[PDB]
Amino acid sequence: TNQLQYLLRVVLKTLWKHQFAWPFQQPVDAVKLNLPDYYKIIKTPMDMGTIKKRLENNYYWNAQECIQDFNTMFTNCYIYNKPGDDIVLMAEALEKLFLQKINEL
């Protein structure tokens, strides 16, 4: 079974319908959210809308490159936000689901 295909049809598909997914479906808009230094602190922004476009448009060399984009999404969230913030609890729940889907591949 092709792993990029699985990341698109299973992993992304599963994360996207999760009740905590909506803050991660598009780039963090630091201007609208009034987030100071977000772009100073987060040098490589990432989100599942960008990942979806990259899967649909042949961007990735391999599955590991797409997995590291998911991980960049999670770690950006942990780096910027304080532990126990709602957004961090949401990211952690999605990351657990992501790991479950990746471990079944």
Ligand X SMILES: CCS(=O)(=O)Nc1ccc(OCCOCCOCCOCCOc2ccc(NS(=O)(=O)CC)cc2-c2cn(C)c(=O)c3ccccc23)c(-c2cn(C)c(=O)c3ccccc23)c1
* Residue 83: CB minimum distance to its own copies, A: 20
* Residue 20: CB minimum distance to its own copies, A: 9
- Euclidean distance between CA atoms 41 and 84, whole angstroms: 19
From 14, 39, 13, select the one nearest 27 (Cα to Cα): 39
Binding mask 10-29 for its own copies (x = CB under 8 A): ---------x-xx--x---x
34 binds its own copies (CB under 8 A): yes
Question: Token pair of 86, please?
Answer: 């709602």
Chain contacts with its own copies (rule: CB under 8 A): 19, 21-22, 25, 29, 32-34
